[PDB]
Enzyme design. Structure first.
Site, mmCIF file in Angstrom:
data_model
loop_
_atom_site.group_PDB
_atom_site.id
_atom_site.type_symbol
_atom_site.label_atom_id
_atom_site.label_comp_id
_atom_site.label_asym_id
_atom_site.label_seq_id
_atom_site.Cartn_x
_atom_site.Cartn_y
_atom_site.Cartn_z
ATOM 1 N N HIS A 186 0.857 -1.207 0.000
ATOM 2 C CA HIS A 186 0.000 0.000 0.000
ATOM 3 C C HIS A 186 0.882 1.242 0.000
ATOM 4 C CE1 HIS A 186 0.180 0.417 4.530
ATOM 5 N NE2 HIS A 186 -0.030 1.687 4.176
ATOM 6 N N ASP B 127 -0.061 -7.481 1.914
ATOM 7 C CA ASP B 127 0.439 -6.077 1.883
ATOM 8 C C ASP B 127 1.954 -6.126 1.999
ATOM 9 O OD1 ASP B 127 0.606 -3.365 1.749
ATOM 10 O OD2 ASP B 127 -0.168 -3.013 3.799
ATOM 11 N N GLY C 128 2.507 6.987 8.219
ATOM 12 C CA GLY C 128 3.873 7.336 7.946
ATOM 13 C C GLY C 128 4.883 6.312 8.404
ATOM 14 N N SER D 34 3.997 3.145 7.920
ATOM 15 C CA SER D 34 3.642 2.113 6.987
ATOM 16 C C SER D 34 4.807 1.641 6.191
ATOM 17 C CB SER D 34 2.592 2.654 6.033
ATOM 18 O OG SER D 34 1.344 2.729 6.713
ATOM 19 N N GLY D 35 4.911 0.324 5.973
ATOM 20 C CA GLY D 35 5.992 -0.298 5.232
ATOM 21 C C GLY D 35 7.191 -0.610 6.043
#
Ligand SMILES: [Ca+2]
Length: 223
Positions: free
Chosen positions: A40, A84, A175, A177-178
């Site tokens: 995402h 994801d 922020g 994320s990942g």
């Protein structure tokens, strides 16, 4: 990261910042050429920033390397956030050193209750918005599958786990994320989703990296 602490410069040496003119997501260096992040977080035009602490100041240990390729999981579903995960290849190999280092992939899945390290440059407020310049860290336990399913009924697949604190106050956030969830020295999670940040009964949801090791290995063997 809400309710976390300042990690300390370059003490999370596999943490990357993905930049498209600005920091927008974290990632994890898994070898000199490859970063794991969340599907995402996909954007075109990614520059991977390694060796960062303050993402707004050049402090002297950074390597900025363009992505050459990004590979979203074949079965990523943006509607449910199942699968994801994304791989990002760097245009050139990072120089590995004391401040830029890879994190091991798992062999086995993590145990419920394990305390893991989650890190990132995401929002630090549960109500409102404040983005830190320096890297933040949080120690958070893997929650049981039963507890995670109860929190998000109908929405947790076998490729997701929850981690954090059901009473609220400590979580990853926008922020982050990942970026990584590291448990016993292995990359076991990727910051994926959650309802709000650090809210009661709404823990963070993370991509279960140990379900992807065969895809990661065959993709990197082939690209
Ligand atoms: Ca910097």
């Amino acid at each position: 990261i809400v309710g976390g602490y300042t990690c300390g410069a370059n003490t999370v040496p596999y943490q990357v910042s993905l930049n498209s003119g600005y920091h927008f997501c974290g990632g994890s260096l898994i070898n000199s050429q490859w970063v794991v992040s969340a599907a995402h977080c996909y954007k075109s035009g990614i520059q991977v920033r390694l060796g960062e602490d303050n993402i707004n100041v050049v402090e002297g240990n950074e390597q900025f390397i363009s992505a050459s390729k990004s590979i979203v999981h074949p079965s990523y579903n943006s509607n449910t956030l199942n699968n994801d995960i994304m791989l990002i290849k760097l245009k050139s190999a990072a120089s590995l050193n004391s401040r830029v280092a890879s994190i091991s992939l798992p062999t086995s899945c993590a145990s419920a209750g394990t305390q893991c390290l989650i890190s990132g440059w995401g929002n630090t407020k549960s109500s409102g918005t404040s983005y830190p310049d320096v890297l933040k860290c949080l120690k958070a336990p893997i929650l049981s599958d039963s507890s995670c399913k109860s929190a998000y009924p109908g929405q947790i697949t076998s490729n997701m786990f929850c981690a954090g604190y059901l009473e609220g106050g400590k979580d990853s956030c926008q922020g982050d994320s990942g970026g990584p969830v590291v448990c016993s020295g292995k990359l076991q999670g990727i910051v994926s989703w959650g309802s709000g940040c650090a809210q009661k009964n709404k823990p963070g949801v993370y991509t279960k990296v140990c379900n992807y090791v065969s895809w990661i290995k065959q993709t990197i063997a082939s690209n």
